[PDB]
């Protein structure tokens, strides 16, 4: 089926002065056909709108080999700030556009295919385990790893 969409990490740090933050959006080997996937900026504690960041929402087209893509969110810079800002970017709904999934008005098939081919023709993608990345606007970053 059309692949699971998820981000690389659950937690990231930027600073305003980065200009624009990016998350890489991955797609599993379910990458059969083209799927379009929206995203949008979601503050946790922030002012939002155009005020600690610009609300950055759009759609990303993911084709077969294209199973790596990115989301850009411009950060606004005001400096000398006494407060940590926090936001994340969540995905909307992945939708298959290479196919045209529609109602089964007629698909005369064999018995096995009556469900099996029908389900395969719906091909519906879904979100994954980490379809969001939490960003903290703060000095520098912290990172760790374990296991080979």
């Amino acid at each position: 089926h059309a692949g699971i969409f998820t981000f690389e990490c659950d937690t990231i740090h930027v600073s305003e002065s980065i200009g624009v933050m990016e998350v890489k959006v991955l797609r599993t080997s379910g990458a059969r056909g083209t799927v379009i996937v929206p995203f949008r900026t979601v503050e946790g504690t922030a002012k939002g709108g155009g005020e600690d960041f610009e609300d950055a929402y759009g759609e990303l087209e993911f084709k077969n080999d294209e199973t790596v893509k990115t989301i850009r969110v411009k950060i606004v810079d005001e400096e000398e700030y006494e407060r940590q800002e926090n936001f994340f970017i969540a995905l909307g709904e992945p939708k298959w556009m290479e196919r045209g999934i529609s109602e089964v008005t007629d698909r005369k098939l064999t018995v096995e295919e009556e469900e099996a081919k029908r389900i395969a023709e719906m091909g519906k993608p879904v979100l994954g385990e980490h379809p969001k990345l939490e960003v903290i606007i703060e000095e520098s970053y912290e990172f760790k790893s374990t296991v080979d």
Side-chain angles (χ1 to χ4, degrees):
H1 247 53
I4 265 72
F5 294 88
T6 186
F7 291 175
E8 282 181 307
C9 301
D10 289 303
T11 313
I12 192 249
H13 270 234
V14 297
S15 303
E16 299 153 59
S17 316
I18 196 187
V20 50
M21 87 88 57
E22 230 174 25
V23 328
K24 306 189 208 72
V25 197
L26 312 316
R27 183 188 186 195
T28 196
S29 57
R32 304 308 112 194
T34 299
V35 171
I36 215 148
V37 191
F39 61 91
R40 66 98 83 256
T41 311
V42 179
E43 52 93 30
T45 168
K47 353 290 219 301
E51 192 160 310
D52 72 294
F53 55 69
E54 289 181 342
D55 187 6
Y57 45 86
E59 282 201 318
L60 305 159
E61 91 297 344
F62 288 80
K63 308 181 198 72
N64 186 217
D65 196 48
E66 301 188 2
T67 61
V68 65
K69 197 62 65 144
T70 8
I71 289 168
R72 272 190 286 179
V73 178
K74 202 210 87 179
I75 318 299
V76 296
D77 186 278
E78 66 181 313
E79 250 270 62
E80 298 196 66
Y81 225 68
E82 297 189 299
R83 207 194 88 93
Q84 187 183 96
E85 303 290 319
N86 153 254
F87 84 93
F88 0 101
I89 311 157
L91 299 169
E93 275 192 301
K95 298 168 286 188
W96 208 6
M97 308 285 198
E98 173 137 316
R99 293 305 245 93
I101 166 175
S102 194
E103 193 169 60
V104 188
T105 313
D106 178 26
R107 291 295 179 102
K108 187 184 184 301
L109 293 158
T110 187
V111 173
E112 307 106 284
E113 280 194 299
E114 228 213 295
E115 70 176 298
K117 188 67 160 59
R118 187 199 309 231
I119 296 157
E121 288 286 304
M122 302 191 195
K124 291 227 295 178
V126 295
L127 302 178
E129 295 176 2
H130 316 267
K132 185 156 68 67
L133 170 52
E134 176 163 61
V135 198
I136 291 273
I137 304 181
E138 176 62 88
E139 194 236 70
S140 201
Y141 59 94
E142 185 268 295
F143 74 99
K144 63 187 72 62
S145 57
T146 182
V147 185
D148 302 83

